[PDB]
Amino acid sequence: LXLLXX
């Protein structure tokens, strides 16, 4: 998710 994993 963007700048957090997926």
What the block records as the tokens of 6 is 């997926």
What approach was used to elucidate this structure? NMR
How far the first Cα of the chain sits from its last, in Å, is 4
5 in helix, strand or coil? coil
- 1-6 residues labelled b (16+ CB within 10 A) or e (exposed): eeeeee
Please provide residue 4's backbone torsions phi and psi, each rounded to the nearest 5 degrees.
-145, 90
Q: With H, G, I as helix, E, B as strand and everything else as coil, classify residue 3.
A: coil
Q: Residue 6: what residue type? A: X
- The helix, strand and coil proportions of the chain, stated in percent and rounded to the nearest 5, come to 0, 0, 100
How many Cα atoms within 13 Å fall on the side-chain side of residue 4?
1
Look up tokens 């994993």; give the residue. Answer: 5
> Looking at beta carbons, which pairs linking 1-5 to residues 24 or more positions away fall under 8 Å?
none
